[PDB]
């Protein structure tokens, strides 16, 4: 159940754990989901998001 990530939309902390709001490649924006940081294999996207905030 791993899927291609298009971009990181947002970031939050919930219950002490960092979560990223993801747009999934090839899926509509209605399918965007919040995922815990350890669910991601997107070092390029994460570093770009964190550098750009």
């Amino acid at each position: 159940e791993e899927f291609a990530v298009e971009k990181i939309i947002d970031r939050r902390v919930r219950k002490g754990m960092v979560e990223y709001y993801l747009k999934w490649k090839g899926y509509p924006e209605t399918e965007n989901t919040w995922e815990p940081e350890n669910n991601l294999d997107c070092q390029d996207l994460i570093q770009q998001y964190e550098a750009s905030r």
């Binding site: 159940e1 899927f3 990530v5 993801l22 989901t33 669910n39 294999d41 997107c42 996207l45």
Partner: peptide, 6 residues
């Protein structure tokens, strides 16, 4: 550039 979807 992938992620697990919970």
């Amino acid at each position: 550039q992938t992620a697990r979807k919970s």
